[PDB]
Subunit: 267 residues, 4 copies
Amino acid sequence: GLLDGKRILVSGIITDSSIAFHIARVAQEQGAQLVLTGFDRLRLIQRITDRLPAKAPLLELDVQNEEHLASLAGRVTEAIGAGNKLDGVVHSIGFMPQTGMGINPFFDAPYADVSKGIHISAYSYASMAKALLPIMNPGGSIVGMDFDPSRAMPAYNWMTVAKSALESVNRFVAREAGKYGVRSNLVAAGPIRTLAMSAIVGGALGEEAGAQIQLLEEGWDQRAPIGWNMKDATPVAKTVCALLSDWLPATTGDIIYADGGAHTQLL
Amino acid sequence: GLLDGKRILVSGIITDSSIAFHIARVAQEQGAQLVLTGFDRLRLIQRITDRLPAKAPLLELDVQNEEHLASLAGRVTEAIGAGNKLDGVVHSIGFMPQTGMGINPFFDAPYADVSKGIHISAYSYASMAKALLPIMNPGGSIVGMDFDPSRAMPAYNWMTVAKSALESVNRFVAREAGKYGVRSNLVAAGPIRTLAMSAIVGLGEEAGAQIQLLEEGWDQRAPIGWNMKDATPVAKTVCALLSDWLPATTGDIIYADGGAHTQLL
Amino acid sequence: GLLDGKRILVSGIITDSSIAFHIARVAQEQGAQLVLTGFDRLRLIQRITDRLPAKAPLLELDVQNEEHLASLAGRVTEAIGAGNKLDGVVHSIGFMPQTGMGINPFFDAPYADVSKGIHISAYSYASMAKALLPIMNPGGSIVGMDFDPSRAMPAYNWMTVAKSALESVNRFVAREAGKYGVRSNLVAAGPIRTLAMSAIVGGALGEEAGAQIQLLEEGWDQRAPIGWNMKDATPVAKTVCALLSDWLPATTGDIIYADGGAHTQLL
Amino acid sequence: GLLDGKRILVSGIITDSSIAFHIARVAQEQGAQLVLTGFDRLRLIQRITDRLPAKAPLLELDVQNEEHLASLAGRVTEAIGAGNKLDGVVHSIGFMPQTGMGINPFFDAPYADVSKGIHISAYSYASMAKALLPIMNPGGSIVGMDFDPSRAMPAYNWMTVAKSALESVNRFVAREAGKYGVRSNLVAAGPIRTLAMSAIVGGALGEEAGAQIQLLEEGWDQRAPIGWNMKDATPVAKTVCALLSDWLPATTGDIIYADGGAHTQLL
Ligand SMILES: NC(=O)c1ccc[n+]([C@@H]2O[C@H](COP(=O)([O-])OP(=O)(O)OC[C@H]3O[C@@H](n4cnc5c(N)ncnc54)[C@H](O)[C@@H]3O)[C@@H](O)[C@H]2O)c1
Ligand SMILES: NC(=O)c1ccc[n+]([C@@H]2O[C@H](COP(=O)([O-])OP(=O)(O)OC[C@H]3O[C@@H](n4cnc5c(N)ncnc54)[C@H](O)[C@@H]3O)[C@@H](O)[C@H]2O)c1
Ligand SMILES: NC(=O)c1ccc[n+]([C@@H]2O[C@H](COP(=O)([O-])OP(=O)(O)OC[C@H]3O[C@@H](n4cnc5c(N)ncnc54)[C@H](O)[C@@H]3O)[C@@H](O)[C@H]2O)c1
Ligand SMILES: NC(=O)c1ccc[n+]([C@@H]2O[C@H](COP(=O)([O-])OP(=O)(O)OC[C@H]3O[C@@H](n4cnc5c(N)ncnc54)[C@H](O)[C@@H]3O)[C@@H](O)[C@H]2O)c1
Ligand SMILES: CCCCCCc1cc(=O)c(Oc2ccc(N)cc2C)cn1C
Ligand SMILES: CCCCCCc1cc(=O)c(Oc2ccc(N)cc2C)cn1C
Ligand SMILES: CCCCCCc1cc(=O)c(Oc2ccc(N)cc2C)cn1C
Ligand SMILES: CCCCCCc1cc(=O)c(Oc2ccc(N)cc2C)cn1C
């Protein structure tokens, strides 16, 4: 078992298509003991996580809620037992209001919406690290999910800006985490069909955005030297487990691309 | 005159050490006709801008104020005369509350503070472009100021995050600006002793020494050297982007840092 | 004139479509006094350079010829007069044997061929700097031509590797040039129709390489926020002139992109 | 056993301080069956490989020898048995003549020397993939060693240029390897005390260049959020093994940094 004996917190499960659900599944298959966190729809999330290979405690965490963050470490400790600490933390959380996405003009997104998106998608990586580092073991690993924002693209709009901010946040979280002997890294995944952008991807919220996204997906598989399957989150989940393991011990503040190699190819 | 006959808006002047003051000075020396914008202390800003080579109208602009942004294009047009449009726009605006800077712990900056910083330092680049693109001529140029955030570093903390956001915003503003025949670019400057240098050492008496060490280190790393007391090479670079001489460059970052970012030691 | 009173050496003219021909034309329009260097077909190059706005001396330079490089500074000095130095140098020189490009398999290019391409396309940037720095004025500028090699692509093959090497060479030339108060930079241009790859671009050396290149060009103009005209070298020439001027005085070891903004956009 | 049942070729062992020695040791600890290749000093190499946890066959391979490369796959097959194929290949091979490094001026390295260095350090990554891909299993992995050349630095000089070329070569090897269902990646390590470059360091002793090197090397530990120990190759060896495993299945054409996170930090 790649993660035998390791205690890992996984946030971000909302459906069985969630990248976090697959991370959790693979982690448990590899021997990890999990604590899960969920947002807003905890009754539904509980039914979904009951389908994981092993039973895991589910805790509520809205990353915009200061009370939730202040009590998190205490709640986790109660879940894993006094005297035990975490070895891993997975941040698989993102949101950008519709005004900041799709066919909505880039200039028309009010700052209040953009600010909410950046709070949830980027700042929360730092606040979860702040909350959880005091209960992590040395040798531990924090991993977040990125979508390569180094270039602009249609439809992704303000979420691209939030991911640029997240990459920067990760480099600073690494500085803090290193004081605890903990690594911090992002996995930059290729596009996966999940609930988050399903309405935009399907064309429901503007045919143009749907068409642009189809072009992006087709080009991604084309450019990836080993191809890319947008319906299979397993390669991404495996990569996250690699970073949670002891086998990338000198990598921190960094981004590991689980994208079929697409970002390394122009055409 | 590199910018002869060009009408250019320059934001960001607060003292005669401001990068924006030197941009304005060099632009005027090169024949540009300017409109200036200032934040908050407009009477004091007027006294500062009187030190420029030529007179220029000064307009109030708080980039967090939606009323200011909605009226800006109209106020500019009254300043430059009906029928006339801008050829250039300079965004030289930044702020991050002290909780997000210096020796204050990275984790202790509340989101309200970080969000204000991002609003002023990154989102406002898009806000300005939205307000002014409708009164810009084809061939025009929008330029903002950047400090290379590709790697983390001490003290710069959350402003680094805001600059990472700004670089992303710039790539999207370029998509919009291109529809108008306008380019959008950032100049990533080396460190300059402006009023804002005090923001990164907000420490004790060690501040002066730390700044002196920064200058020593940057000048060593830069293959052509670096003088933190001299904003002129940065100002010239901004003027190059405002000119007709980089006509195929957009969404991009020009480094005016003495070449330091290309060297490891 | 942007370059009034400046003495500038321009290498790399072979036809009137050469990027160097347009650099030369624009520089002369901006008041520069030129010295030109040409390779192999000097009688033909002389006829071509006679069509420039002003007369300029033409010197022979094969960058693989040690005797040519050893005598170059003295020949330039004779051309511009004793007591006078250069303010600028433009390297617009490239070559990669056909085995290293197009439909020819990447693995099948013999090292002898790849080595020749790297010699001419990358090492010679250092060779020319070595020869000419001793006769350059402080405030001077060396500029070479790059095609962004940060990602792999079809057909460009080993020339991509040579450009990666050239970018690295440029960073080291900057260190040396700095001692003389001279800047060194590359301009990464978008694709321009010139003699160099004309046979491959036309499909004459393999239809698939022609097809791949057409796709690359179509995509380039599409992504470029201000568009891209592959038949117009003028924007690239202007950019080189900007770097030769006094207006980018703090930029060195660097790469300026004159590509319509295409490299900043994914799609 | 991370590499249980995998058959892996490891090149580049010359001393028990070689990065390749540590890669081989860790791979064997994780259940891999190895074939080793050595250059020039085969009697010494055999004595050294006797220090590994398990016996592995040693084959001669000079990457500049076309006959060695032509016969390599047949020799490997005889070593692992007909019907069996490789799951992994490690390229841990590098060389740049002294003229191209250290206190020797950058401009004084003759191209003959630079070309040799680029042949061994960059082109041979493609040569080895060409020779071995036909006997690799799908799901397989090729890994090479890189030293981040994105910025210039004192002393490393023309080796930096060779590594820039290598990174470009890796992106093209990934295109070819993908046709076989094989991944290709580099690990960019922080500085390790392997005895490589001892002659370069020795020439720089007490000089400015020597001081520069010590400042540069020690810069990794300063900048690395988790620190960096130049005396310990194990974290690098582990990272290579992670890439050889099934746990980074969507990463190709890419660079993994095993440098303590130093490259993500400016100071
Ligand atoms: N799907 C892709 O193609 C892709 C590619 C690269 C990166 N990512 C990133 O991967 C992560 C997971 O995305 P996904 O595709 O699995 O979509 P998803 O919808 O299945 O998961 C996103 C999660 O964010 C959670 N969330 C939203 N607001 C929250 C809040 N205030 N507090 C706590 N949690 C909150 C949601 O409840 C949900 O569980 C995100 O960071 C996303 O940006 C997705
Ligand atoms: N000084 C450096 O070393 C350096 C290096 C690279 C980039 N920069 C950037 O250059 C730009 C100018 O900085 P500077 O060094 O000249 O400092 P400065 O203090 O002289 O200028 C900063 C400007 O931001 C303006 N500003 C703050 N809040 C505003 C608001 N709500 N609305 C409108 N304007 C507002 C200030 O009033 C001021 O005029 C900034 O973007 C800064 O981040 C500075
Ligand atoms: N055309 C494009 O799209 C494009 C895009 C980006 C960069 N570039 C680069 O721009 C430069 C000029 O290319 P071009 O497109 O004008 O093609 P070109 O054929 O018009 O010019 C290439 C020059 O290299 C010269 N050359 C070849 N071997 C030489 C040697 N041994 N010694 C001296 N000179 C030698 C040729 O004689 C010729 O004058 C090259 O470095 C090329 O790689 C071209
Ligand atoms: N030591 C470091 O700090 C460091 C850091 C990053 C990357 N690297 C890279 O790691 C790899 C291994 O280097 P090392 O430090 O273990 O030094 P090393 O001397 O122990 O290994 C280098 C290997 O290259 C082999 N080699 C040289 N010419 C050859 C040829 N013609 N044919 C076949 N093999 C040949 C040598 O025989 C030797 O075994 C190299 O690519 C090096 O550049 C080293
Ligand atoms: C134009 C880009 C197409 C590929 C996008 C890949 C991609 C990147 C994503 O970051 C993503 O996740 C979100 C996006 C938005 C919101 N509100 C919430 C989430 C969790 C989904 N997907 C699918
Ligand atoms: C570790 C070295 C960092 C050097 C930073 C250079 C630098 C970069 C800057 O972005 C900057 O400007 C500000 C920063 C903060 C605020 N509130 C307002 C401003 C205008 C000043 N300086 C001087
Ligand atoms: C697949 C990429 C297509 C666009 C390539 C752009 C481009 C890049 C080039 O480097 C180029 O110049 C050469 C290329 C090869 C040789 N032997 C000599 C030269 C001078 C021409 N072109 C046109
Ligand atoms: C000046 C940079 C200091 C840190 C360099 C790290 C480093 C990088 C290396 O690429 C390296 O390996 C060689 C270098 C040259 C040759 N001929 C052969 C080899 C195997 C050793 N080291 C130690």
